[PDB]
RNA sequence: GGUUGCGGCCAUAUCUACCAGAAAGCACCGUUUCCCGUCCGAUCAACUGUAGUUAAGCUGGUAAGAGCCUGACCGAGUAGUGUAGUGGGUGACCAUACGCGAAACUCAGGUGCUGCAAUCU
RNA sequence: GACAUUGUCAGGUGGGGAGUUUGGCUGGGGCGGCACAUCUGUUAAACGAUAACGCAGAUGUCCUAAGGGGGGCUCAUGGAGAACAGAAAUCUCCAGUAGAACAAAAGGGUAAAAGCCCCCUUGAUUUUGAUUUUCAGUGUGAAUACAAACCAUGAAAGUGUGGCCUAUCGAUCCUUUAGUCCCUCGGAAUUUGAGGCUAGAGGUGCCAGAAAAGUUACCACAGGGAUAACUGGCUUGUGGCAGUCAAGCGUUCAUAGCGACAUUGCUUUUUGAUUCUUCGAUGUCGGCUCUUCCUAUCAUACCGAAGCAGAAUUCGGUAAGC
RNA sequence: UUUCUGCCCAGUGCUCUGAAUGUCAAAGUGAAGAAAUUCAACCAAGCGCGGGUAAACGGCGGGAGUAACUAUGACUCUCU
RNA sequence: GAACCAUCUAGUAGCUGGUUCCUGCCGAAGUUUCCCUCAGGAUAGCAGAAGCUCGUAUCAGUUUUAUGAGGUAAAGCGAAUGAUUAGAGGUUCCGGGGUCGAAAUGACCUUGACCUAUUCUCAAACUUUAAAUAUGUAAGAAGUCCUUGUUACUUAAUUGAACGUGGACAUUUGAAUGAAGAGCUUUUAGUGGGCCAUUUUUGGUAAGCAGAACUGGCGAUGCGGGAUGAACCGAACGUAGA
RNA sequence: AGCGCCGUGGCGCAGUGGAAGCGCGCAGGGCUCAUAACCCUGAUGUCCUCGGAUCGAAACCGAGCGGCGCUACCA
């Protein structure tokens, strides 16, 4: 009682029905996987920039 | 394999927190105590009629066990464990290999 | 079935142990023959030869067992039984060479 | 005991040569590939006649040996032993497999059928193409009418269609007849055991003059 | 049984080349990668550390992270019925800059120069590229180019 | 332009055989107290630039040179190949239509270029 | 006679009896094998993916160095030499792009090294995170790149989170070890004991992990033509039959009759191969009986050929009427 | 009915012996502990050891060489 | 080969059979992973429904330009590895024979190897080279340029890195074509036996045989044709007329 | 066909990485009038062939050759 092992028939049609959406990209991507020494400084840099602009347009 | 009886490695003993000397032994499992909760539950379940109530393993397939070294920091007596790969023969005694010797 | 296999494992192991046991008494009685009794000496040689041939056969079966048969648990006792069979084998070999050597043959005359 | 050639006529499988993955093949039945006056010089036999395939198929080594023996015997008997040089320009390297099934009654009781059907080497064949030369024979012009008949007799031992073509080349070379003639009237040819080496304008002038001195003696 | 390892079917892919074996030249280490650069992936068999998987050979991605000896690249992998983003940490020996990106940047600055120039004249720059238009009319003369008549050739053996 | 230090591309740079090399520079070269290393001051280390030599290294040139590199409407639009037909052929396979398109071969040409710093008749 | 007996616990014996089990894949099942967890090359059709009981092989280890760092050197082989010494001992020179070695299978990779020798070492360490492969973007295994420490080596740049890279392995429950010596034992305390938290080990190879022997020719049920044993159908290896060629046999002579080495076919009266139909049944070997059909003709009719004198015989044709 | 029922107790069973460094449960005894408890020693039968038993279950060889023709092998060697 | 009667009992069944009105709209799958899993499930996929945020775009089973990657087809072996045909010229202080020989680091000839230059034929697990078809990315407003602000990161250093302020560059805003609305979420059915055709392709002598790759189909689909046929050719369907 | 075993002196057989032996035969001498028996000695091998791993094996791992034994069932 052998049977079919494997096929890829109809799979591309199934995928291209409502398929091959490219992932939505954004401004400001996620900073995980980035160097922690870079993130730890970028936090302080952004905080200082925000404080400087707030003192500028207070 | 051959592992030396001593090894200089890290010790997280709250006073060392650095690489100190360590005396290396081999880990043995220790006698399984009675009055452990699982043992009490097992005796209670095995008592009476019904026979053996839990599975008992038969289909042994490994030939080896992973060896575990118990390291003893010589300063603060902190003990650590680290496992090695599976080896058939194991040795703590240091008979170091020499290269240019005859058979 | 692994059960039938380990049954014949245990059967051969007890047969090997009693073969070692009735080899060792023949060995010590060979050493205590009082060598004046040369007939009894040769009888003891030919008697332990049969036992070591029986153990040799058992050792070949242990060889095949450790090679192909998937013993799966008892490599240790099969190897220790094999080591005992072979040490009895070289014991018999020392005995049999000691009796086979001749007192004025060239092998005796070169180096005592 | 051998299967008919129609079971292995066509190139259905990839080339399957004897290698370090076979290690157990039957040796080829054809062994001699060059015959006649094989030590004859190049200008002794100008004319070259080819028996060339027209199918993409496989020629068995037994058929090659049979056709070789046929043409050799005919031309040696009715033209002399040393009037031609024949060369088989195919070599059986493809190894034919057979999945031998039992021919007894109740063979299905112990046959297993198509399970593990991978065959065993039992033959050798040469994979030919459209316009691939099978036989090439070089002679003088006084032997043409009989070497054509020898190749025509050898053609019956082969499956498929083969053509007999008179080549415009001088013997077993690659040059045409008048090109070789105008090359050999000068000293830029130099005979070998059976073939001929040519002078090129490339290379060291010392060795080029050491050989072919008649071309440089202008 | 079947075999699908990390380097299955990588025999010719991770071969080095003909006659450029050995160590790699120093420009690969001297090149500077920044976050947002577009880089191509081509693995080097001489460097076994930080290799990409065989799927990413010849793939082009965007840098998102720069480390001591490696580079983080974002690839779009086709899985099922969608693409997923895959973050790869690759040593720079497997990485080269994409030339199409810099050639686009030169086109950008050239278009900027054209616009800044012709803003002073108002001559309708027409900065877009255009495909190969069909060729327009021309008059070809026969002076020294009288047409030479050709004919099909008969069949011949040529062996 | 030569040379030295550090290089980039890594044979147009390599290999084989000869010939030449002002100046300077490199080099060979001379010594073993010291630091140092060897069975061996040969290599390595140190010292002198003194006693000498372009012999070698190195650079350049030569060779119907090998190799390598570039190009060709040289092979060849060939082999192969995407697409099409109720095309051919018993079949094997092969033509045609719209397209893409090699490799070997042959011929011709070439045989390192160049960056930073210093120095030289 | 205070022993037997009787009562309750404890150990042994106990197919006499009770209950249950007695893998999967599979060109039917069984036997065989593992294609069941994995690795290399190929099949695989130049991204990736990709099957068969496809092909050629391999794994359940081994290593305190065969790991890490640094320094020095160059290997296989060949040639030419030197007492004993020769084909092979040790020493010297030249050539040597790797033709060697790198634990193992194969494939990549490596030459002032990744190889060989020497020096020092434990980074084969700690804390958790992110990412790649298999992939459901789950787990496991393996691997990658950083961060925070502590270290090793080296003049230093640097390199080092095991093995140059691709394989070398394991959940819940339970037990046990290490750490915190931290939390709880719930009327309040102290000490044992126990239970918890974090990180490992003890193992499931049918490898995402049941605790498991057979037989039924006395058999039963649910089903299956997803699946065999008849026919039928495709195919024709095998069987049978027929050709083509012509080395030779036939005293002489290839072809009267034959005919090797080869090669092209036909048939479905052989046996296979397959699994399409049929398992809510197509009554299954042979014989008897009875009819018809085919020709690849044994006889009979008429002919042709012969190594046909006659006789007998052999080859072949029209022929299935009988 | 008659005539006979050969060899094998190694295995599997069955059965006889128990002086015992064998194994050896519960109860009991001793030591430690503050106790729960732990560790010892002792430890019946049975296994184990040692005998018997096949009109119990059952089982009851292989290869060479060898006699004035050949054959065969009374005979011999060896494994067992 | 464990009677009969009643009850537990409507015992369980991954298995067989059946499953009751019409019309309208949309519309599949026989594939991935895991399971004592292979006649079944879960999971992802395909499908429906409910919609929600917006209003022509942060698109596309497509091409072009530019730029990568590959190791198949082909080709090659007087290029490596391996296989392989035939001679030629040589070398033996150094293969085996004989001859002249007492022998000689002696001579002649025979035959084997080793080298040189050639020559014939080859490779799924060989290769220098190397396509066609397929395949990745980019073609800008989330962009470019100028100036100078933040940092505990980095540099010898206001040196760079990242994110910024302010200013400038707008409809040819950075190739073509098309967009039928674009994007997003929830929930759930059925399916998880497939089969056929062209082309590539493995096993097999072959098979209406078994097993893969791409695409298109049948299943789920009628219609005209192929007399006849699930798949082929043509063309896909509301009811009618021309 | 599959699986498993075996292949060693003239015959029957052992044989584990530092590496070939047992018995009977065979040869020599002795004893005996002589032959056996007996005594003292000696010799004996392509370890089936081929390749590989190892610094090295008959042994380890592969290719075949030869001979044996087991299975080949449900209809
Ligand atoms: Mg299925
Ligand atoms: Mg499968
Ligand atoms: Mg109780
Ligand atoms: Mg109880
Ligand atoms: Mg059948
Ligand atoms: Mg490549
Ligand atoms: Mg590593
Ligand atoms: Mg029972
Ligand atoms: Mg089954
Ligand atoms: Mg691929
Ligand atoms: Mg190493
Ligand atoms: Mg080094
Ligand atoms: Mg993972
Ligand atoms: Mg580090
Ligand atoms: Mg616990
Ligand atoms: Mg565990
Ligand atoms: Mg599983
Ligand atoms: Mg039963
Ligand atoms: Mg039955
Ligand atoms: Mg039965
Ligand atoms: Mg069926
Ligand atoms: Mg047939
Ligand atoms: Mg036939
Ligand atoms: Mg059927
Ligand atoms: Mg039926
Ligand atoms: Mg029916
Ligand atoms: Mg019916
Ligand atoms: Mg009927
Ligand atoms: Mg007829
Ligand atoms: Mg009896
Ligand atoms: Mg008994
Ligand atoms: Mg008995
Ligand atoms: Mg007790
Ligand atoms: Mg007792
Ligand atoms: Mg019911
Ligand atoms: Mg399970
Ligand atoms: Mg069904
Ligand atoms: Mg492209
Ligand atoms: Mg490939
Ligand atoms: Mg090819
Ligand atoms: Mg080529
Ligand atoms: Mg070659
Ligand atoms: Mg679903
Ligand atoms: Mg589902
Ligand atoms: Mg259906
Ligand atoms: Mg249709
Ligand atoms: Mg069409
Ligand atoms: Mg009409
Ligand atoms: Mg004698
Ligand atoms: Mg005598
Ligand atoms: Zn400590």
Swiss-Prot record, chain A:
Q: Does the keyword Cytoplasm apply?
A: yes
Alphabetized, the UniProt keywords read: Cytoplasm, Isopeptide bond, Ribonucleoprotein, Ribosomal protein, Ubl conjugation
What spans are recorded as compositionally biased (Basic residues)?
A: 1-25
| Cellular localisation | Cytoplasm
Pfam families annotated for this entry?
Ribosomal_L29e (PF01779)
Biological process GO annotation list? cytoplasmic translation
Annotated region Disordered: where? 1-36
Q: Does the record's keyword annotation contain Ribonucleoprotein? A: yes
Q: What InterPro entries does the record tag this protein with?
A: Ribosomal_eL29
The GO terms this record gives for MF are: structural constituent of ribosome
Which domain of life does this protein belong to? Eukaryota
Glycyl lysine isopeptide (Lys-Gly) (interchain with G-Cter in ubiquitin) cross-link site: 51
| One cellular component (GO) term of this entry | cytosolic large ribosomal subunit
- Outline the subunit composition: Component of the large ribosomal subunit (LSU). Mature yeast ribosomes consist of a small (40S) and a large (60S) subunit. The 40S small subunit contains 1 molecule of ribosomal RNA (18S rRNA) and 33 different proteins (encoded by 57 genes). The large 60S subunit contains 3 rRNA molecules (25S, 5.8S and 5S rRNA) and 46 different proteins (encoded by 81 genes).
The role this protein plays is: Component of the ribosome, a large ribonucleoprotein complex responsible for the synthesis of proteins in the cell. The small ribosomal subunit (SSU) binds messenger RNAs (mRNAs) and translates the encoded message by selecting cognate aminoacyl-transfer RNA (tRNA) molecules. The large subunit (LSU) contains the ribosomal catalytic site termed the peptidyl transferase center (PTC), which catalyzes the formation of peptide bonds, thereby polymerizing the amino acids delivered by tRNAs into a polypeptide chain.
Please share what else the UniProt entry notes about this protein.
Present with 51100 molecules/cell in log phase SD medium.
**Family the entry assigns:** Belongs to the eukaryotic ribosomal protein eL29 family.
Name of the gene encoding the protein in the UniProt record = RPL29
Swiss-Prot record, chain B:
Record-linked InterPro entries: Ribosomal_eL44, Ribosomal_LSU_eL42, Ribosomal_zn-bd
**Keywords associated with the record:** Antibiotic resistance, Cycloheximide resistance, Cytoplasm, Methylation, Ribonucleoprotein, Ribosomal protein
Where does the UniProt entry say this protein principally localizes?
A: cytoplasm
* Source superkingdom: Eukaryota
Q: Where in the cell is it found?
A: Cytoplasm
Q: Name any one Pfam family assigned in the record.
A: Ribosomal_L44
Q: Which residues carry this modification: N6-methyllysine?
A: 39, 54
UniProt PTM comment? In wild-type cells, 78% of L42 is monomethylated at both Lys-39 and Lys-54, and 22% are a mixture of species with either residue monomethylated.
List the record's Gene Ontology CC terms alphabetically.
cytosol; cytosolic large ribosomal subunit
Molecular function (GO) terms for this protein are: structural constituent of ribosome
Any one Gene Ontology BP term? response to cycloheximide
Described by its record, this protein's role is as follows: Component of the ribosome, a large ribonucleoprotein complex responsible for the synthesis of proteins in the cell. The small ribosomal subunit (SSU) binds messenger RNAs (mRNAs) and translates the encoded message by selecting cognate aminoacyl-transfer RNA (tRNA) molecules. The large subunit (LSU) contains the ribosomal catalytic site termed the peptidyl transferase center (PTC), which catalyzes the formation of peptide bonds, thereby polymerizing the amino acids delivered by tRNAs into a polypeptide chain.
Q: What else is known?
A: Present with 13600 molecules/cell in log phase SD medium. There are 2 genes for eL42 in yeast.
PANTHER family linked to this entry: 60S RIBOSOMAL PROTEIN L36A/L44 (PTHR10369)
Q: Which family does it belong to?
A: Belongs to the eukaryotic ribosomal protein eL42 family.
Protein name (record): Large ribosomal subunit protein eL42A
Which organism encodes this protein?
Saccharomyces cerevisiae (strain ATCC 204508 / S288c)
UniProtKB/Swiss-Prot annotation, chain D:
Q: Which Pfam families match?
A: Ribosomal_L16 (PF00252)
Quote the InterPro entries the UniProt record gives: Ribosomal_uL16 (IPR047873), Ribosomal_uL16_CS_euk_arc (IPR018255), Ribosomal_uL16_dom (IPR016180), Ribosomal_uL16_euk_arch (IPR001197), Ribosomal_uL16_sf (IPR036920)
Of the GO CC terms on this record, one is: cytoplasm
Outcome of mutating residue 193 to D, per the record? In QSR1-1; synthetic lethal
Localization of this protein: Cytoplasm
Q: Which CDD domains match?
A: Ribosomal_L16_L10e (cd01433)
Segments carrying the region annotation (2 X 15-17 AA approximate repeats) are 166-215
Query: GO terms for molecular function, please?
Result: structural constituent of ribosome
sequence repeats (start-end): 166-180, 199-215
Gene3D superfamilies cross-referenced by the UniProt entry: 3.30.60.300, Ribosomal protein L10e/L16
| Keyword annotations of the record | Cytoplasm, Isopeptide bond, Phosphoprotein, Repeat, Ribonucleoprotein, Ribosomal protein, Ubl conjugation
The record's principal subcellular location, in a coarse class, is cytoplasm
Which Gene Ontology terms describe the biological processes this protein takes part in?
Answer: cytoplasmic translation; ribosomal large subunit assembly; translation; translational termination
Q: Which residues carry this modification: Phosphoserine?
A: 142, 204
Q: Where is this cross-link: Glycyl lysine isopeptide (Lys-Gly) (interchain with G-Cter in ubiquitin)?
A: 39, 100
Q: What does this protein do?
A: Component of the ribosome, a large ribonucleoprotein complex responsible for the synthesis of proteins in the cell. The small ribosomal subunit (SSU) binds messenger RNAs (mRNAs) and translates the encoded message by selecting cognate aminoacyl-transfer RNA (tRNA) molecules. The large subunit (LSU) contains the ribosomal catalytic site termed the peptidyl transferase center (PTC), which catalyzes the formation of peptide bonds, thereby polymerizing the amino acids delivered by tRNAs into a polypeptide chain.
Q: Which family does it belong to?
A: Belongs to the universal ribosomal protein uL16 family.
Question: What is this protein called in UniProt?
Answer: Large ribosomal subunit protein uL16
Q: Which gene encodes it?
A: RPL10
UniProtKB/Swiss-Prot annotation, chain E:
* Any one cellular-component term (Gene Ontology): cytosolic large ribosomal subunit
Q: Which GO terms describe its molecular function?
A: structural constituent of ribosome
Pfam families, A to Z:
Ribosomal_L21e (PF01157)
> Might you name a Gene Ontology BP term for this protein?
cytoplasmic translation
Question: Where, per UniProt, does this protein localize?
Answer: Cytoplasm
Q: Which InterPro entries match?
A: Ribosomal_eL21, Ribosomal_eL21_CS, Ribosomal_eL21_sf, Translation_prot_SH3-like_sf
Q: Identify the keywords attached in UniProt to this record, alphabetized.
A: Cytoplasm, Isopeptide bond, Ribonucleoprotein, Ribosomal protein, Ubl conjugation
Cite the location of the cross-link Glycyl lysine isopeptide (Lys-Gly) (interchain with G-Cter in ubiquitin) from the record: 31
SUPFAM superfamilies registered for this protein in UniProt: Translation proteins SH3-like domain
Q: Which residues form a coiled coil?
A: none
Matches recorded under Gene3D superfamilies: 6.10.250.3260, Ribosomal protein L21
* PROSITE patterns attached to this UniProt entry: RIBOSOMAL_L21E
Quaternary structure note: Component of the large ribosomal subunit (LSU). Mature yeast ribosomes consist of a small (40S) and a large (60S) subunit. The 40S small subunit contains 1 molecule of ribosomal RNA (18S rRNA) and 33 different proteins (encoded by 57 genes). The large 60S subunit contains 3 rRNA molecules (25S, 5.8S and 5S rRNA) and 46 different proteins (encoded by 81 genes).
Give the family from UniProt. Belongs to the eukaryotic ribosomal protein eL21 family.
Q: What else is known?
A: There are 2 genes for eL21 in yeast.
Report what the protein is called: Large ribosomal subunit protein eL21A
Q: Which organism is it from?
A: Saccharomyces cerevisiae (strain ATCC 204508 / S288c) (Baker's yeast)
């Amino acid at each position: 009682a052998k049977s079919k092992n494997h096929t890829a028939h109809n799979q591309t049609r199934k995928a291209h029905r409502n398929g091959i959406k490219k992932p939505k990209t954004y401004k400001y991507p996620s900073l995980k996987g980035v160097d922690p020494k870079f993130r730890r400084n970028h936090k302080h840099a952004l905080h200082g920039t925000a404080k400087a602009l707030a003192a500028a347009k207070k | 394999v051959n592992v030396p009886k001593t090894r200089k490695t890290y010790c997280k003993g709250k006073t060392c927190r650095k690489h100190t000397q360590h005396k290396v032994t081999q880990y043995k499992a220790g006698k399984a105590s009675l009055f452990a909760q699982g043992k009490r539950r097992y005796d209670r379940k095995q008592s009476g009629f019904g026979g053996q109530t839990k599975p008992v393993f038969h289909k042994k397939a490994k030939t080896t066990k992973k060896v575990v070294l118990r390291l003893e920091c010589v300063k603060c007596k902190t003990r650590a464990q680290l496992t090695l790969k599976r080896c058939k023969h194991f040795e703590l005694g240091g008979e170091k290999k020499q290269k240019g010797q005859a058979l | 079935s692994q059960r039938k296999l380990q049954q014949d494992i245990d059967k051969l192991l007890k047969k090997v142990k009693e073969g070692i046991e009735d080899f060792d008494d023949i060995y010590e009685k060979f050493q205590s023959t009082d060598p004046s009794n040369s007939s009894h000496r040769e009888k003891l040689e030919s008697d332990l030869k049969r036992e070591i041939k029986k153990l040799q056969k058992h050792r070949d079966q242990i060889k095949t067992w450790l090679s192909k048969e998937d013993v799966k648990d008892k490599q240790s006792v099969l190897m220790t039984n094999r080591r005992l069979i072979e040490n009895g084998m070289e014991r018999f070999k020392s005995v049999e060479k000691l009796m086979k050597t001749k007192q004025f043959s060239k092998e005796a005359l070169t180096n005592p | 005991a051998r299967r008919p050639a129609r079971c292995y006529r066509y190139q259905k499988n990839k080339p399957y040569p004897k290698s370090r993955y076979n290690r157990a093949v039957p040796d080829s039945k054809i062994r001699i590939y060059d015959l006649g006056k094989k030590k004859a010089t190049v200008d002794e036999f100008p004319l070259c006649v080819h028996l060339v395939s027209n199918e993409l198929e496989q020629l068995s080594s037994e058929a090659l040996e049979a056709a070789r023996i046929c043409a050799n015997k005919y031309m040696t008997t009715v033209s002399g032993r040393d009037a031609f040089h024949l060369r088989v320009r195919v070599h059986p390297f493809h190894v034919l497999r057979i999945n031998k099934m039992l021919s007894c009654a109740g063979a299905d009781r112990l046959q297993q059928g198509m399970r593990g059907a991978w065959g065993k080497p039992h033959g050798l064949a040469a994979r030919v193409d459209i316009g691939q030369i099978i036989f090439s024979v070089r002679t003088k012009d006084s032997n043409k009418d009989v070497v054509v008949e020898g190749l025509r007799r050898a053609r019956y031992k082969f499956p498929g269609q083969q053509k007999i073509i008179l080549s415009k080349k001088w013997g077993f070379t690659n040059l045409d007849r008048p090109e070789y003639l105008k090359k050999r009237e000068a000293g830029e040819v130099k005979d070998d055991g059976a073939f001929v080496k040519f002078l090129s304008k490339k290379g060291s002038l010392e060795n080029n003059i050491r050989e072919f001195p008649e071309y440089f003696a202008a | 049984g079947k075999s699908h390892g990390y380097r299955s079917r990588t025999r010719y892919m991770f071969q080095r080349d003909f006659r450029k074996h050995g160590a790699v030249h120093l420009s690969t280490y001297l090149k500077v990668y920044k976050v947002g650069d577009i880089v191509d992936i081509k693995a080097n068999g001489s460097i076994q550390k930080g290799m990409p998987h065989k799927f990413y050979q010849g793939k082009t991605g965007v840098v998102y992270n720069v480390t001591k000896s490696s580079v983080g690249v974002i690839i779009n992998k086709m899985v099922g019925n969608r693409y997923l983003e895959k973050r790869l940490n690759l040593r720079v020996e497997h990485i080269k800059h994409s030339k199409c990106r810099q050639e686009f940047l030169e086109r950008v600055k050239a278009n900027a120069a054209k616009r800044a120039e012709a803003k002073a004249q108002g001559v309708a720059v027409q900065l877009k590229r255009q495909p190969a238009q069909p060729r327009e009319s021309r008059i070809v003369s026969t002076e020294g180019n009288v047409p030479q008549t050709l004919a099909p050739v008969p069949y011949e053996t040529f062996i």
